Design a protein around this ligand. Sequence first.
Ligand SMILES: Nc1ncnc2c1ncn2[C@@H]1O[C@H](COP(=O)(O)O)[C@@H](OP(=O)(O)O)[C@H]1O
Ligand SMILES: Nc1ncnc2c1ncn2[C@@H]1O[C@H](COP(=O)(O)O)[C@@H](OP(=O)(O)O)[C@H]1O
Ligand SMILES: Oc1c(Cl)c(Cl)c(Cl)c(Cl)c1Cl
Ligand SMILES: Oc1c(Cl)c(Cl)c(Cl)c(Cl)c1Cl
Ligand SMILES: Oc1c(Cl)c(Cl)c(Cl)c(Cl)c1Cl
Lengths: 285, 288
Amino acid sequence: RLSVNYVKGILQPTDTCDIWDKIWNFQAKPDDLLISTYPKAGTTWTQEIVELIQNEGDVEKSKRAPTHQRFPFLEMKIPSLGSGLEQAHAMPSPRILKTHLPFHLLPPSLLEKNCKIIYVARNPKDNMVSYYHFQRMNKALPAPGTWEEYFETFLAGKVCWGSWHEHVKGWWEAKDKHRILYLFYEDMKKNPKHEIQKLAEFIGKKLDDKVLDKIVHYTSFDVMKQNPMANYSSIPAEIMDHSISPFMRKGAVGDWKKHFTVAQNERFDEDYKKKMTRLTFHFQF
Amino acid sequence: KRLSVNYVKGILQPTDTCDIWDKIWNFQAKPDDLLISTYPKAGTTWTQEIVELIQNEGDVEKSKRAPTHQRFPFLEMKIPSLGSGLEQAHAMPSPRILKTHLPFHLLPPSLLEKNCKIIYVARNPKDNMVSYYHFQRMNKALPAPGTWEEYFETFLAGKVCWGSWHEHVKGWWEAKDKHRILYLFYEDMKKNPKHEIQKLAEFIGKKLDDKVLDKIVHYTSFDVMKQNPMANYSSIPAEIMDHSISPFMRKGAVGDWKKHFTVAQNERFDEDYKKKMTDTRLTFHFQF
Ligand SMILES: Nc1ncnc2c1ncn2[C@@H]1O[C@H](COP(=O)(O)O)[C@@H](OP(=O)(O)O)[C@H]1O
Ligand SMILES: Nc1ncnc2c1ncn2[C@@H]1O[C@H](COP(=O)(O)O)[C@@H](OP(=O)(O)O)[C@H]1O
Ligand SMILES: Oc1c(Cl)c(Cl)c(Cl)c(Cl)c1Cl
Ligand SMILES: Oc1c(Cl)c(Cl)c(Cl)c(Cl)c1Cl
Ligand SMILES: Oc1c(Cl)c(Cl)c(Cl)c(Cl)c1Cl
């Protein structure tokens, strides 16, 4: 596995730590769209939707290259994948950018330029489960240990990008005074058309029902799982082993119930209440 | 090596194919017999220890004379190298303190005809399931439990020795209305041991002073009994029980099930439980 270290208080792959100053001083464009998420909150889904909205349903164009090549992952720097920062550097407008950075670590240019930001939050228990399996299959990230160990690791924020709680909280507090659309993975799953419409309005695109319906179809889990440009199948096998756990794993809400013991659930809820707001009303515990 | 299990009168038993049921059913009780009755793992060993110390007014010496299984005849038991509970009962001087796991409808009628005092102990089914799971892992007289996920469904289905937990606790709860049964709960015993000891003493008919009550509370605590070689099942042939797999005195805690059940298992359990428990007020009693 690739090594990780602390940069500005959060675990990151070693190569990200080494280029922090470069990341911090990222140069945004006023017309950049930023997709911001805690890892495994629904980044790939949201990116696919946002591009399809921007290109008005042009499914052929979204198949031009895989997700990681289409969308610069700002803080990412991994051997065989290059630097997301430099991917963006070279890229002409309109850019659709990705980050998992907690809000306090966000390159200030993105705020200075008042870029439209889409933040997606996900139920933390499903988020833990998704991140657990991701660490099992992704060798750029630390070994997760046993489920029992990982539960504690996640709870304490000792995973890359830090505390889930701090992450969702900082971004929620930020939405009040910045150009942020704050969405929930669960709302997207329950009524994708409604959330896609909300996205389009925020992006400033008027779409008719036909195109909206088309985006709902192409961005459904069962369709995206089969799309070799959207399912992370194109990542070198030396980094992501889909036979351990596929990137497009389940795409469901409530998978956490199959993983959490009642004891873990009670400990999680107790811990949550201590760390955590109106944000709480948007999750089902 | 695991011992074969067989159906006897509709329930699995850790016993051979030579049917000796009639002898058990025709067991000859005495009016001063005390009976401790439990679903497997509901708190038999604990209750026996309390009951004898009450009967002997706190005489801990007497209770150390031999281990649990030799002090207390296990009526339906017939296991290679363990002998026969029936023969052990026949040989046991009065006043006997007897043990059974039989569901109420299979109870030898002499225990009823003689109006014997019976102490039944129920335990919440989730902790009961977990306790029985680990007991089957360690105890070679019982079936191999399979995986935890398999055993969960086996237990839910009542396909374990002594049958359905649900039917067991319900039958005994209904029985208490017509027969001389003191119906106790493991969780009450754990939460206020002194209170349940006083209740038992009054039922058995012993007027114990405060010092004796406190003494029994001390000696029947999990931590003390766990270290007591006459009360912890250490003396069972190593070929029957392997305590290195799981000790008989495992945790002695209410809510240990929470470390075993996933939330999904819990929801499946709770729905199953509702469907099986609509006709009993027992449910207003179980603590988890
Ligand atoms: N179209 C879609 N609908 C719902 N979930 C999707 C999706 N595409 C990807 N996902 C899920 O979102 C998670 C990945 O998030 P990210 O893109 O932020 O890394 C995975 O969750 P699971 O591991 O629960 O399946 C993945 O299956
Ligand atoms: N003094 C005591 N206090 C609480 N629990 C006790 C106890 N003595 C034994 N037990 C528990 O009762 C269960 C055994 O029941 P039985 O005697 O009917 O076979 C075991 O539960 P656990 O497996 O949950 O530890 C055992 O640890
Ligand atoms: O979201 C991602 C994270 Cl957190 C890592 Cl570490 C990697 Cl390698 C990839 Cl590809 C994605 Cl998509
Ligand atoms: O309660 C018991 C049961 Cl059910 C069996 Cl099968 C055995 Cl072998 C023993 Cl020792 C006890 Cl205590
Ligand atoms: O002998 C004992 C008596 Cl009588 C009491 Cl009351 C208590 Cl609490 C303890 Cl610990 C012992 Cl050892």
